[PDB]
Amino acid sequence: HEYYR
Amino acid sequence: EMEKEFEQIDKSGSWAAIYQDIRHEASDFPCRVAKLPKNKNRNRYRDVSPFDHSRIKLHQNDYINASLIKMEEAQRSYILTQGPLPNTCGHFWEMVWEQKSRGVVMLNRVMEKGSLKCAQYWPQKEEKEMIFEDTNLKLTLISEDIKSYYTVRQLELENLTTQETREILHFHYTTWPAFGVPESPASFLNFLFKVRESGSLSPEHGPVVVHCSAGIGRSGTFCLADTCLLLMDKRKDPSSVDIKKVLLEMRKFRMGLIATADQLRFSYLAVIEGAKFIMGDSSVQDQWKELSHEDL
């Protein structure tokens, strides 16, 4: 989502 | 030489093991300014923030998601930053101005596999200049040299206050996928040496600004290769540069540089190939250009 992971 | 260690890791297939090690050994410094609430909308990713100790300060709210990587022994500084947001385009150019940068290297595309990775922060037509009213800057496309996998634009940045102007060179690499690698070392090193030749990296200028989507993965790869080649020349010894120690040194200044094990492998591939030029084979440069197919 809006996490780079 | 250094070609030893690479042939080895490839056979034993331990690249991811090496990469996982760096993640474990990498610095971990506080990111308090980046985590303030008033700065939530200034960060594109919630797990990617500048360390407090190396963050760029706007000369204004002074926060921008960008880090000064100051490689003391290589004697070069870079600013790595995220792809600007719709609301931080004025901050980005404010930063470029206040830090006296001459070049911007952009390694992502605005549109990347359906995902929006970046705002259109520079003008695409000479006649439609951009005006950033929060920071009092005006930005104008002057000319552009389009090549097959990259484009160099010449821009004019005007400080609407003092009315002074500067020329900024924008180097846009268009064929480097997120979490992926360039097509070949030649196409990468050809790009890198284009940037080098422009003088944008010269120390009489401020640090070059390098960004991708988060400013850590592809940006990290670009900056590690350039620095390793710098240390090769300064130390005057190719097999002396240890890519791992250099990358950990860069990671004292910004988290997460180099995003995949393959990007680390390519980093080795690029430094190894680049040593041909450092060792004296100055003409391998022309080889890279022809190999890169930059024409048509």
Author numbering:
A (entry chain D): 1159 to 1163
B (entry chain A): 2 to 61, 64 to 299
What did the original publication write about this model?
Here we identify PTP1B as an inhibitor of IL-6 and show that, in vitro, it can dephosphorylate all four members of the JAK family. Dephosphorylation of substrate is initiated by nucleophilic attack by the active-site cysteine (Cys215) to form a phosphoenzyme intermediate followed by hydrolysis of the cysteinyl-phosphate to release free phosphate. Asp181 acts as both a proton donor, enabling protonation of the tyrosyl leaving group, and as a proton acceptor, receiving a proton from the water molecule that hydrolyzes the phosphoenzyme intermediate.
Incorporation of the D181A/Q262A mutations leads to a five order-of-magnitude reduction in catalytic activity compared to WT PTP1B20. Nevertheless, in multiple co-substrate structures of this mutant, we observed that both steps of the reaction had occurred; dephosphorylation of the pTyr, presumably via the usual cysteinyl phosphate intermediate, as well as hydrolysis of that cysteinyl-phosphate. Surprisingly, the products of the phosphatase reaction (both the phosphate and the tyrosyl-peptide) were clearly visible in the active site in all four structures. In some of the JAK activation loop structures with the D181A/Q262A double mutant the register of the peptide in the active site is possibly scrambled, with populations of both the first and second tyrosines being present in the active site.
